[PDB]
Amino acid sequence: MEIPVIEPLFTKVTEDIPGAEGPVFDKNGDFYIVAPEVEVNGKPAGEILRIDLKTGKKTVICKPEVNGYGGIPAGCQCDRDANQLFVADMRLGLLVVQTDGTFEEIAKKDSEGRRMQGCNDCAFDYEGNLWITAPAGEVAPADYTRSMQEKFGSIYCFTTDGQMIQVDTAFQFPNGIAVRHMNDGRPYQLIVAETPTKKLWSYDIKGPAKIENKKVWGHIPGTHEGGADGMDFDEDNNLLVANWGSSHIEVFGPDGGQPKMRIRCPFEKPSNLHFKPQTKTIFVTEHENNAVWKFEWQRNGKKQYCETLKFGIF
Ligand SMILES: [Ca+2]
Ligand SMILES: [Ca+2]
């Protein structure tokens, strides 16, 4: 159109990853994907994988389970001060996963003593606070439920002082999440995808675990089943959003509203995305083929928290 569409070349990265999700780079430049939808005898047995980018070969580093309840690991962020992954899990809540494949479950309950909800994606701000979507109901051992039909999805902030703070509720499948920063580094806006409603929501970030000014920020095209899944900013603060079911990744400008551009994918179900540091390359997971691809965007990604320095000067 208008809406202009681009059709970049998609190159295959790896294959056969059920529910391929949560692409992420660690501080060494290793690449990981999660496979939330792996099952064994009809019960969850989701996986965290390292991918060798040269070969496409997959290694399962972690198949998390707590007291026999398998995980549904769905979204990732790399930490800054240690090379460890924070993983949103639809059964287990928030996990911290080491490169050796060991892991810990961070919260059974929130800061107000409510049972934790299962999580789908997360985003660190540059202050080190982790903003998390929780579209599932209560974590294991509660019977699994998810908010695709009914409005019981929540949002959390897991703070630098270790508090798991519920910051909003009553979403119909909160999904992708991202933090916008001022040029100086200050976090100031939170964006949350609400998948089936075809909305992106915004909040002003007033401080750690302090959001206000909830607004319907962006509109996701289409009336397909699905909607916005994963998202990330480019270095100019354009927001790229996988629109699962639409065959496109949407591109929003800084001010939201309607997409300014769309990216056609050679598949119907883009799920999540991540830039390779220092490059224009976006890795994309998708659920038509349960596979991972890459393509070149117009500019580099916005640096993730793990690319910033605790002891930086500038
Ligand atoms: Ca997701
Ligand atoms: Ca990402």
Author numbering: 1 to 314
Task: Copy the relevant paper text.
The diisopropyl fluorophosphatase (DFPase) from the squid Loligo vulgaris is able to detoxify a broad range of organophosphorous compounds, including tabun, sarin and soman although its favorite substrate remains the diisopropyl fluorophosphate. The DFPase is a 35 kDa calcium-dependent enzyme that exhibits a six-bladed ß-propeller structure with two calcium ions in a central water-filled tunnel, similar to that of the mammalian recombinant paraoxonase-1. Blum et al. elicited the following mechanism based on a H218O isotope labeling experiment: the calcium-coordinated Asp_229 was identified as the nucleophile that attacks the phosphorus center of the substrate via the formation of a phosphoenzyme intermediate. Another possible catalytic mechanism for DFPase might involve the activation of a water molecule, as in PTEs, PLLs, human paraoxonase-1, and the lactonase from Staphylococcus aureus (drug resistance protein 35), a DFPase structural homologue.
After refinement, the R and Rfree factors of the DFPase X-ray model improved from 11.1 and 12.8% initially, down to 10.3 and 12.1%, respectively. Out of the 481 water molecules in the DFPase structure, the positions of hydrogen atoms of 20 water molecules could be established solely on account of electron density peaks. The small fraction of water molecules for which hydrogen atoms are visible interestingly comprise active site water molecules, thereby allowing us to construct unequivocally, the hydration shell and the water hydrogen-bond network in the DFPase central tunnel. The hydrogen bond network of water molecules is different in the X-N and X-ray structures, despite the similar localization of water oxygen atoms. In addition, the donor-acceptor (H…O) distances turn out to be shorter in the X-ray structure than in the X-N model. In the X-ray structure, a strong electron density peak (maximum contour: 4σ) is visible close to the equivalent water molecule (HOH_524), which can be unambiguously allocated to one of its hydrogen atom. Moreover, this electron density peak displays an elliptical shape, whereas all the other electron density peaks revealing water hydrogen atoms in the DFPase X-ray structure are spherical. The analysis of the chemical environment of the water molecule in the X-ray structure shows that HOH_524 is involved in the following interactions: (i) Its hydrogen atom, located with a strong electron density peak described earlier, points towards HOH 511 and forms a canonical hydrogen bond (Ow…Ow distance: 2.82 Å, angle Ow-Hw…Ow = 136°). (iii) The oxygen atom of HOH_524 is coordinated to the catalytic calcium (distance: 2.5 Å) and (iv) further interacts with the carboxylate side chain of Asp_229. Our investigation into the DFPase active site in the X-ray structure suggests that the calcium-coordinated water molecule HOH_524 is partially activated into a hydroxide ion through proton relocation towards the nearby Asp_229 Oδ2 atom.
